[PDB]
Design a protein around this ligand. Structure first.
Ligand SMILES: [Zn+2]
Length: 359
């Protein structure tokens, strides 16, 4: 426990670096938004307030940030891709109205590739003119042109485009977000009245990966639940209600980062991310809904409880998306058997040796 605390204290030492790089990133993205909204294809584009920094849980890599630009899209209908539950084709129910996105259709289908290509292009053009310092664009691959920026200092910013839908959440989410006994049924009702998002993400398809498919995203809900996280409305707003929920999440994230860094020459950990750890953490909150199960003085147990849960997920190769229960983040489609066995082994070693990877 003392060791765990020491690790947390240490992680605090990165806060200023990260905060300053973020404080620059906001400048770059604000400039970017300003320009992007002038394009007829994106005039309603806005910043979505989501992500590890916004959740007060970005603990390392100040050179690295994730941002989502949301784009309100006029009334859409979704068609599931196979029975993947998380991947969809986007269609407009149409309304013979002026639709600035018609130039990205494939008949009925809103092409993620064309959208991304325009997004990438405009971003490319609007950066060279200096705000702050200097900025480049890395060119990756995948099923489409994604966008990663290089704010000169090697500050890497991933930009994700996300369609916003103000309609009811898809049926695949019906049994998800099981927070009723933790955060309350009225809260679940409220959250599910909020919009949901769609990000352009190629779905796997037989040794390759095809289609202009979109994946459901609930980053805004994850942020709300992380920052308003207790059964008590005043959890963490006073000295008598300090829980260790956020610290346990930070510890799990740090465990994963440190293991990835250690084995950065093998490729076995490449497919794991803080999203897996966050998802497992949310399930553990569902399992342990009472604030008294997250007493600060119990940091040691609470952390072990997360680790154990994650291990079981790894061992069983099942980690349900917290919002889409039948979407398995650890399915063989997404993560290979060897990566999962290897992480299982390393986490077992760490747990069995008082977590050497921390010191
Ligand atoms: Zn709390």
């Amino acid at each position: 426990a003392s060791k765990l605390r020491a690790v947390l204290e240490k992680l605090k030492l990165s806060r200023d670096d990260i905060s300053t790089a973020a404080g620059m990133v906001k400048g770059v993205v604000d400039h970017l938004l300003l320009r992007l909204k002038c394009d007829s294809a994106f005039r309603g584009v806005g910043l979505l307030n989501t992500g590890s920094y916004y959740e007060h849980v970005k603990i390392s890599a100040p050179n690295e940030f994730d941002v989502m630009f949301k784009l309100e899209v006029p009334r859409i209908q979704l068609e599931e891709y196979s029975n993947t539950r998380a991947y969809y084709f986007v269609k407009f129910k149409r309304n013979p109205k002026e639709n600035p996105l018609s130039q990205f259709l494939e008949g009925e289908i809103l092409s993620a590739s064309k959208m991304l290509s325009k997004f990438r292009k405009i971003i490319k053009e609007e950066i060279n003119d200096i705000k702050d310092t200097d900025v480049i664009m890395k060119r990756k691959r995948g099923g489409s042109p994604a966008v990663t920026l290089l704010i000169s200092e090697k500050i890497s910013v991933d930009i994700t485009l996300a369609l916003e839908s103000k309609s009811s959440w898809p049926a695949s989410t019906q049994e998800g977000l099981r927070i009723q006994n933790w955060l309350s049924a009225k809260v679940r009702k409220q959250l599910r009245l909020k919009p949901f998002y769609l990000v352009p993400k190629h779905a796997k398809e037989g040794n390759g990966f095809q289609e202009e498919t979109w994946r459901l995203s609930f980053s805004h809900i994850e942020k709300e639940i992380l920052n308003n996280h207790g059964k008590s409305k005043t959890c963490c707003e006073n000295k008598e209600e300090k829980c260790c929920r956020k610290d346990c999440l930070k510890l799990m994230k740090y465990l994963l980062e440190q293991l990835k860094e250690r084995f950065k020459d093998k490729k076995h950990l490449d497919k794991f991310s803080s999203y897996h750890v966050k998802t497992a953490f949310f399930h553990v909150c569902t399992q342990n809904p009472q604030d008294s199960q997250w007493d600060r003085k119990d940091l040691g147990l609470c952390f072990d409880n997360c680790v154990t849960y994650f291990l079981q997920c790894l061992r069983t190769e099942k980690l349900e998306n917290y919002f889409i229960p039948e979407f398995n983040l650890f399915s063989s489609n997404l993560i290979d058997k060897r990566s999962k066995e290897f992480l299982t082994k390393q986490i077992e070693y760490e747990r069995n040796n008082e977590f050497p990877v921390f010191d």
